[PDB]
Ligand SMILES: NC(=O)[C@H](Cc1c[nH]c2ccccc12)NC(=O)[C@H](Cc1cc(-c2ccccc2)no1)CP(=O)(O)c1ccccc1
């Protein structure tokens with residue numbers, strides 16, 4: 001994940017490989033679309049859902065070991081991870097399905113916020129030192145616009 005590359009195109013495509021059993025597919029698709037919309041709203045980037053491995057960002061829910069050298073740890077802890085821009089697995093976003101995925105206030109983790117964070121990494125964004133920023137390393141649920149001034153500046157500095 002220590003990559004230093006950005007996408008050389010702005011028409012990004014994503015493929016939802018599979019789903020979590022905690023939420024309806026329609027809810028999941030909408031959550032991801034809304035997470036992407038957060039970044040496309042402040043950049044010339046566009047995100048189009050596709051149905052092929054040829055997508056730039058492949059999204060998948062997994063548990064424990066799932067193919068890469070970074071297995072999930074089950075309940076809590078690591079919630080998900082994504083690889084920086086590049087071919088192959090690069091740009092892909094993985095979500096730990098051992099977590100209780102939900103939305104808004106309440107128990108469990110907001111798939112919307114975590115996705116937005118993950119897509120940030122999939123776009124090449126590094127972590128923020130601002131505790132209130134979306135790209136902060138530690139998950140924290142709060143209401144209001146997910147993107148903090150620092151997140152906007154970071155993404156705009158790249159695209
Ligand atoms: N419960 C949390 O806040 C955990 C804590 C954590 C960070 N790194 C690790 C590593 C191993 C275990 C836990 C953990 N953070 C995450 O699951 C984030 C993912 C995350 C953060 C958020 C988030 C942060 C701030 C505000 C809102 C959501 N949603 O999803 C991991 P990352 O920053 O995407 C990452 C990816 C690749 C390599 C190394 C780290």
Ligand SMILES: [Ca+2]
Pocket residue numbers: 040041042043044045
């Ligand atoms: Ca735009």
Ligand SMILES: [Ca+2]
Pocket residue numbers: 055056057058086087088089090091092
């Ligand atoms: Ca990819």
Ligand SMILES: [Ca+2]
Pocket residue numbers: 072073074075076077078079096098099
């Ligand atoms: Ca976990």
Ligand SMILES: [Ca+2]
Pocket residue numbers: 020021022096097098099100101
């Ligand atoms: Ca789950």
Ligand SMILES: [Ca+2]
Pocket residue numbers: 102103104105106107108
């Ligand atoms: Ca909730």
Ligand SMILES: [Cl-]
Pocket residue numbers: 017018019020
């Ligand atoms: Cl599925």
Ligand SMILES: [Cl-]
Pocket residue numbers: 034
């Ligand atoms: Cl939204």
Ligand SMILES: [Cl-]
Pocket residue numbers: 103104105110111112113
């Ligand atoms: Cl939410």
Ligand SMILES: [Zn+2]
Pocket residue numbers: 066068070081094
């Ligand atoms: Zn993975």
Ligand SMILES: [Zn+2]
Pocket residue numbers: 117121127135136137
């Ligand atoms: Zn992160």
